[PDB]
Amino acid sequence: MNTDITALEKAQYPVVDRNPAFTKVVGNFSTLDYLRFSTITGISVTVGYLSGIKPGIKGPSMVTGGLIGLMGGFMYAYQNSAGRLMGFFPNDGEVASYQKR
Template sequence: MNTDITASEKPQYPVIDRNPPFTAVVGNFNTLDYLRFSSITGVSVVVGYLSGIIPLHLHYLSHRVWIFNFINIDAGIKPGLKGPSMVTGGLIGLMGGFMYAYQNSAGRLMGFFPNEGEVARYQKRGFSS
């Protein structure tokens, strides 16, 4: 029984490592991966903070229509809500950003994403693809 998760699709680019370990994938992060990782984290921190500031009230109108209404920003806000929601948003963004960067890095090593830089680097070190 074939349990290889990549068996359903053949790589379109040179394969560097068909089943890369965690350390190889993280070590293969490039500048764009780190930029995406930090951008997703940063945006999530801001969204988390804003979700702790702005109360979102749902109002049920006639004809069964729900609308979002931003009213009286200071009403109903607990003083300690901004910080925890910012931290929670940041942690969610940190995990999501890391998983996105990891997916791209692993995809390049396994040959599913363009990997010219990785192929050149591994050939320069003496590894054959």
């Protein structure tokens, strides 16, 4: 499969890595990325618990909501980290660990 990451609208910030790997993007998670992930996971677990009381399945409903929240929170954090590393988002921190390292 021929692949091409070239985006339609060019990055507006220094490109630290144009196609960062999965492990590299994950290792690039900042404290803000872990804050977004934890907030989305906690809100999802809360909604699962509160919506599950009436049917009587608050536990399993918490599990289902937490799974949805874990998926969405990881997705949001990965999005932010990869976009920073590709220069689509403000990434002064990534540029610091690039000039220095």
